[PDB]
Amino acid sequence: LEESVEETAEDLIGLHNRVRLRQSDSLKREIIENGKFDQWFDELFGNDTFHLYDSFAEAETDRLLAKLAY
Amino acid sequence: VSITDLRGSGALRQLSDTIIALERNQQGDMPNLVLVRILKCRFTGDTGIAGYMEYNKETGWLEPSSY
Amino acid sequence: MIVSAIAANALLESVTKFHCGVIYDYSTAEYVSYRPSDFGAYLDALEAEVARGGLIVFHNGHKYDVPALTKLAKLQLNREFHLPRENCIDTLVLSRLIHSNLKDTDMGLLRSGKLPGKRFGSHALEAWGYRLGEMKGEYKDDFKRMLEEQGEEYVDGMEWWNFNEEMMDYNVQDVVVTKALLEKLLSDKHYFPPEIDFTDVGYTTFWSESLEAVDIEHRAAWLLAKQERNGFPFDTKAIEELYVELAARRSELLRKLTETFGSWVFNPSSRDHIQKKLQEAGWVPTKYTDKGAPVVDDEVLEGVRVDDPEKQAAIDLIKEYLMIQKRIGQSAEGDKAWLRYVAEDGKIHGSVNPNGAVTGRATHAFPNLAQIPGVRSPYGEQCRAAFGAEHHLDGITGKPWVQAGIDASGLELRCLAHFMARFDNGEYAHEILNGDIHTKNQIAAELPTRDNAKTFIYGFLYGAGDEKIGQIVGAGKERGKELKKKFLENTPAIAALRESIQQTLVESSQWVAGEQQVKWKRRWIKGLDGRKVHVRSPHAALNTLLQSAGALICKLWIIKTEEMLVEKGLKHGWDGDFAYMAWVHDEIQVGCRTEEIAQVVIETAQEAMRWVGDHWNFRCLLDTEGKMGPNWAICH
Amino acid sequence: ERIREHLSSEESVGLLFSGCTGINDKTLGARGGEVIMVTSGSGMGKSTFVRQQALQWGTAMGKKVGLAM
């Protein structure tokens, strides 16, 4: 609830590949231009193991706990 | 100035991704000298004192200082 | 990954037929030989490695092989063949990247007797075969000597006229040297990590898991190779109208300068002349030149005072005369004069070596496009006018293209601010942006004029002694020490800059018989992209550091500018919208079909220059300035 | 695609705080999506510091800056 799923995934992707993809303007552009992004991406999320929540627009309880329970 | 001296409840210590703080002694020998202190940075996590600056009474700018 | 090298009938500028080519596949571990009736399948084999996303290894492929195979496929097979820049590797570029410090390396290679004296430090394929021990011989020599025991003679470069079975065998010879040289470059773990066996990877993994310097150099070599093929449009008539004004002036000057001295023959450009003269007009040399007699010495000539008014007045006629020979010897009579290099498209295709230096600043030759006299230098205005996009036609309207000249605004001093922002927290860097950094250096070093600060900051940074510094105020080697030390006290960050960095490469130093036997930590300074940039003496090195930053900045700069221009929609070449004509260190000359395109070129270059600064997180701010016009005298 | 869109279209480090480096050394500027928190004593340059950022960004690095004074 403090970072959108694209930023958290950015962390997860970089963390998975033993790097700090967030703190390198060089590394971000790297995996994009030589097509290394899709490579790491499929390697990680390819098994549909990771699922997230996104709204960031003042989360509540009714009904958010419902979504967590759902 | 630390995180507790912040106005409002302790939500501002959480939502704000980066916190820039200015400190200066306007009753001392260096009133135009201002210290910049990073109190929080979710991006980097590197906190502490950044650098120094000086208020140019002519331009009204914050030119970076030595030290 | 596949490794290959080809053999054609001639050079890139008139090649007509494909002879042979050999392809070693790492997945197959076996070579494949091709012949003139197998040219078609050769292009497909390269396309197949592109479809797999693999890699294709050539030596000088970026500059010759790839454009030749594009050219040969159009007239022989009438098919379009364009190897993607991402799917190409050039051992020559990596050799110039990884082994830029070959000049020393050859000392041990000389002791062995393994390296030819004609192939010292060279990066040619055969030159490396002797280094790695793979040269069973050379095709050119197994051709000459076998032509003897056949009868017929030899013409300079006839071995490439026709497909011969000896070429097909030495075509393999060039391939096995490329493979072994590739593995020799892949075995350098500073550039190629051990965790990745790059010999069996896709192109996607190769560029990113390699050092960043590997990627830029291949992008740099590909782009500049395009620039050579684009060429620089040339007004032949204009230069011709100059040799007339110069040769007539030379002869008229020669005539007046033969009335002043007799014979038994006045020489234009001889050293045995002034040696015979002036020391007969009443001039005693202040400064000599080596083992015997002083050289031409253009410097002293300005100050030579002889009691003979005719001899004295003739000195300035000599000054002009020698300079006239310089332009002529560059524009007409030289073996590498411009008029000899104009191609049949009305353009001068000046070559350029990418990382032909320790720092990465390029070198230009045949002809040296980067030494054309400046507009401030005499007759340089006319010279610069001869190099212009206006001297090119147009694919359609015919209306002369417009030229865009963009340079890096004060790159050297901003590079200094970046490395010293590590010690002053952006103090000096803001003085650049706030402006008048030469004014601050003037105050810091206690110089009377701002211009004296300009000639100071560059000399001091690069290791000038005290004479050039002393001659600023009309003195010698005496005045200099107090000028240098005072600047150091008023600018601590510059002094602190040389503190941590110069003591990052040493443990302890020691003088032995006048030679400093410094115990090094690493005999190489890291560049902006991790490459090895060696120096020599730790007494300065800063000059190497700053020029390395600047050359690496512009290299990426001209790459991203073209990359953004292509991304925005512009096509590169004389048939598209813009064409690179010349890259000169911190300035570039770009041809543009319309003024509107040129304006975009100027803006994009600035956008790319800020992109470079954000990319390497440059502490100082980089800016550029563009000039629109017909030629080069206008763009600068 | 949203991840693809983010890395490619955001300005990465959208800007760098002017008037003093070292802030850039510890923060790497500000990004699109975060919230920079500026504070100090009464009349010690909170407005002056931020006003420089608004000016510089909207001048040298032509960003469209929104003000709520």
From Swiss-Prot, chain B:
Residues the record annotates as the site (dTTP/dATP binding) are 24, 42, 55
UniProt lists the family membership as follows:
Belongs to the Teseptimavirus DNA helicase/primase family.
The UniProt subunit note reads as follows: Homohexamer. Assembles as a hexamer onto linear or circular ssDNA in the presence of ATP or dTTP. Present in a mixture of heptamers and hexamers in the absence of DNA. Interacts (via C-terminus) with the viral DNA polymerase that is bound to DNA; this interaction is essential to initiate leading-strand DNA synthesis. The priming complex consists of 2 DNA polymerases and 1 helicase-primase hexamer that assemble on the DNA template. Interacts with the single-stranded DNA-binding protein.
Task: Tell me, in a sentence or two, what this protein's role is.
Answer: ATP-dependent DNA helicase and primase essential for viral DNA replication and recombination. The helicase moves 5' -> 3' on the lagging strand template, unwinding the DNA duplex ahead of the leading strand polymerase at the replication fork and generating ssDNA for both leading and lagging strand synthesis. ATP or dTTP hydrolysis propels each helicase domain to translocate 2 nt per step sequentially along DNA. Mediates strand transfer when a joint molecule is available and participates in recombinational DNA repair through its role in strand exchange.
Domain comment text? The N-terminus zinc finger domain is essential for delivering the primed DNA template to the DNA polymerase. The central core domain contains the primase activity. The C-terminus region is responsible for the helicase activity and binds 1 Mg(2+)-dTTP.
- What is this protein's name? DNA helicase/primase
Which source organism does the UniProt entry give? Escherichia phage T7 (Bacteriophage T7)
Curated annotation (Swiss-Prot), chain C:
Q: Where is this region: Polymerase?
A: 202-636
Sorted alphabetically, which InterPro entries does this protein's record hold?
DNA-dir_DNA_pol_A_CS, DNA-dir_DNA_pol_A_palm_dom, DNA/RNA_pol_sf, DNA_polymerase_A, DPOL_T7, RNaseH-like_sf, RNaseH_sf
- Chain sites annotated for binding Mg(2+) 3: 407, 586
Pfam families in alphabetical order? DNA_pol_A
Q: Which cofactors, if any, are listed as required?
A: Mg(2+)
This protein's UniProt keywords? DNA replication, DNA-binding, DNA-directed DNA polymerase, Exonuclease, Host-virus interaction, Hydrolase, Magnesium, Metal-binding, Multifunctional enzyme, Nuclease, Nucleotidyltransferase, Transferase, Viral DNA replication
Tell me, which GO biological process terms does this entry list? DNA synthesis involved in DNA replication; DNA-templated DNA replication; double-strand break repair; viral DNA genome replication
- Residues reported to bind Mg(2+) 4: 407-408, 586
Which parts of the sequence bind Mg(2+) 2?
A: 5, 7, 174
Q: Which residues bind substrate?
A: 438, 450, 454, 458
Region (3'-5'exonuclease) residue spans: 1-187
Molecular function via GO: 3'-5' exonuclease activity; DNA binding; DNA exonuclease activity; DNA-directed DNA polymerase activity; metal ion binding; nucleotide binding
UniProt function note: Replicates viral genomic DNA. This polymerase possesses two enzymatic activities: DNA synthesis (polymerase) and an exonucleolytic activity that degrades single-stranded DNA in the 3'-5' direction. Non-processive DNA polymerase that achieves processivity by binding to host thioredoxin (TrxA). This interaction increases the rate of dNTP incorporation to yield a processivity of approximately 800 nucleotides (nt) per binding event. Interacts with DNA helicase gp4 to coordinate nucleotide polymerization with unwinding of the DNA.
What name goes with this protein?
DNA-directed DNA polymerase
Q: Which organism is it from?
A: Escherichia phage T7 (Bacteriophage T7)
